[model samples]
Target: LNHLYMAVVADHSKRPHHHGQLDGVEAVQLNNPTCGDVISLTVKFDEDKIEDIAFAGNGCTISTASSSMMTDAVIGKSKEEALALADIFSEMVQGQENPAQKELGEAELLAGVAKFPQRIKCSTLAWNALKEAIKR
Candidate 1:
């Protein structure tokens, strides 16, 4: 009955990885105005590489979990690779099947999110924020 029911979402949301902000990191913030999901991504970079990343937010299960997974997937990648992953994630959550979706780590498990059309915004919030961090 619940389209949102999934182990990845439940576990990540409850005990999220990298769920706090970092000092001396570039922070990118975004919110789902439609759902009141707010997030701030603190990205620590080593030149053009994502050395470390974290997120602090007051979002629901999907939003919180998605951010947590995004942090895990994005760290240690180049800025361009991060954006490519973001594109894959956006496509996956919108019901576009991508063979490379597993590159997103635990975040890929969120494919079930495509079932909930309205929740797409929540799942992609951190990704969008990450894009901004890279843009700057």
Candidate 2:
């Protein structure tokens, strides 16, 4: 409902940010077994720093939007920073309090996880995929 996500979620769902595949891909694919949402990431980085990243896949509004927002947030950061950012977003989705949301860009709006518990898996899918690719 509108109370759970508001307009930002709706906007990103329809018009995802950084929605595409990268030229030189890092290759990460994820499937949400719980909801059947699939997302693939193509990240191009150097020296543990994210230089360019993109994604392509099909998911629900939250999954896709979160994926898009995540690409926007992580592209310029190093591996550690991006991982920590993902962790903060993970905690935020768990209804934790933190002042770091502002640094996450539009991803900060996903804080509605407090209102919709199930969306946690969907929203977190993007970051998990990112980490797996980074870890590879």
Candidate 3:
């Protein structure tokens, strides 16, 4: 069961970029030096919530899946909710908690991702960048 889940997670990480110009959002760039993963994240904010998202990047599966999941999790989430997602994701990487069925949704495909300690940053690149961008 775990292996099947991991295979899907790993596959998502390898998914390619579908680059497109996003509207009504701010964008940011972020990198992971130890792993050489780079990501460009565009976040659409409406009032106090995140309305939509798009991503482009060059890196490994961890990077790809991380960004993909991050973008999906934030759409229609209040800024507070998006930040909570960051906290939840961070906990998962640190081996602290699992995002519940409701909270993680498709992002749960990344459960196996925490196994690679060093790659955690690659997996987290986009989420961190989103947080940074919003803080500004």
Error of 2 at 97 (Å): 0.5
* Residue 125 error, candidate 2, Å: 0.3
TM-score for all models, in order of appearance: 0.91, 0.90, 0.82
Best by lDDT: 1
**lDDT of candidate 3 vs native?**
0.72
The lDDT for every candidate, in the order shown, is 0.88, 0.87, 0.72
lDDT of 2 by residue, 49-112 (tens): 9878888888898898899899889987987999999999999999889999888898998898
Worst 10 residues of 1 by lDDT: 1-10
Candidate 1 C-alpha lDDT tens digits along 17-116: 9888989886888888388899988888887998788889888888989999999999989889999999999999889987899899889888988999
lDDT of 1: 0.88
Point out where model 1 deviates above 4 Å: 1-5
Ranking by lDDT: 1, 2, 3
In model 2, the Cα lDDT at residue 68 comes to 86
